[PDB]
Amino acid sequence: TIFEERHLKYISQLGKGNFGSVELCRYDPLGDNTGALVAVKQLQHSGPDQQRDFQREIQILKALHSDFIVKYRGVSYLRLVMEYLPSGCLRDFLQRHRARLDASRLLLYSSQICKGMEYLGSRRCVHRDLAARNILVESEAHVKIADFGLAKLLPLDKDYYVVREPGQSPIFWYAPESLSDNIFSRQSDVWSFGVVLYELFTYCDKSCSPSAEFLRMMVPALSRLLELLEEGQRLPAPPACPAEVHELMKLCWAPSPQDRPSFSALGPQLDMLWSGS
Numbered sequence: 001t002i003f004e005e006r007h008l009k010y011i012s013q014l015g016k017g018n019f020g021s022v023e024l025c026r027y028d029p030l031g032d033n034t035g036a037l038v039a040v041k042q043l044q045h046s047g048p049d050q051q052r053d054f055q056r057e058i059q060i061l062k063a064l065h066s067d068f069i070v071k072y073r074g075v076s077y078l079r080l081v082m083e084y085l086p087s088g089c090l091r092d093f094l095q096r097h098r099a100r101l102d103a104s105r106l107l108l109y110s111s112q113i114c115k116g117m118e119y120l121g122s123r124r125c126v127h128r129d130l131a132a133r134n135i136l137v138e139s140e141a142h143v144k145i146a147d148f149g150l151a152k153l154l155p156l157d158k159d160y161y162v163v164r165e166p167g168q169s170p171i172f173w174y175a176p177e178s179l180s181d182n183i184f185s186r187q188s189d190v191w192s193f194g195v196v197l198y199e200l201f202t203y204c205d206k207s208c209s210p211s212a213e214f215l216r217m218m219v220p221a222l223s224r225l226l227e228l229l230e231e232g233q234r235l236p237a238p239p240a241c242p243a244e245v246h247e248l249m250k251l252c253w254a255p256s257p258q259d260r261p262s263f264s265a266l267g268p269q270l271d272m273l274w275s276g277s
């Protein structure tokens, strides 16, 4: 649980985002290159607000225990040590392996992500950055939610959270209430899950990505996106998308957070489709 810094050997950068970076390191206390590989998050550079956020992220991740959430391994004193999943993120894995991954498998990943989100919700955790680029692949048939850099715990007496600064993530995964009023909730994570189902079923192809679709659907982009959403415009069904999968996405994109299903209602539905595919 406590890793000594001198034993963590730097290999490469894995990714970066919201003021943090994740490195691939070997935890190599013998110094002979035989130790296990780990992913180590740290701030990219120092700053006291980032620091306080980072401490909370660590406390959140340490207290999450799910097969569908990336595993906390410990800390180094300033760094968060996590399991390293060499297949990397689901966005990349989908683009590389599309020819091999059928509808059944995408429904399997969808069910696993839903089940991880159901668990997060039970912990009063709003993830706030759900997207295929932040889901990791453990094996061919197992994914895990990662990137808790923006995650918040809801107080016991309130089911939403208002953020003060504007968001910094690609705008096409945010719910309308987040776009307009910086409100985030478990039901805003359901909106984002609908976009994740869209990514899965397009295999993260860049030409039909959420972003590419907006510049086709056509004043600042954020205001334009909100007007398009208020008018009831949505991303079109992915090529060859099963009808029932598309209906589920549209339900996740109900205008009113209270009309979106919960992850507990979504889960059984995905399983039934997975069993019926």
Ligand SMILES: C[C@H](NC(=O)c1c[nH]c2ncc(Oc3ccccc3)nc12)C1CC1
Binding pocket: 014, 015, 016, 022, 039, 041, 070, 082, 083, 084, 085, 086, 087, 088, 089, 133, 134, 135, 136, 146, 147
């Ligand atoms: C960069 C962040 N990654 C993590 O926090 C990771 C924690 N363990 C990992 N194992 C492999 C892996 O592989 C990669 C490599 C490149 C891009 C994404 C994941 N990334 C991570 C973010 C995805 C959640």
Ligand SMILES: NC(=O)Nc1ccccc1
Binding pocket: 172, 194, 195, 210, 211, 213, 214, 217, 228, 233, 234, 235, 253
């Ligand atoms: N959720 C949803 O349908 N979002 C959207 C719509 C148009 C363009 C980009 C994203």
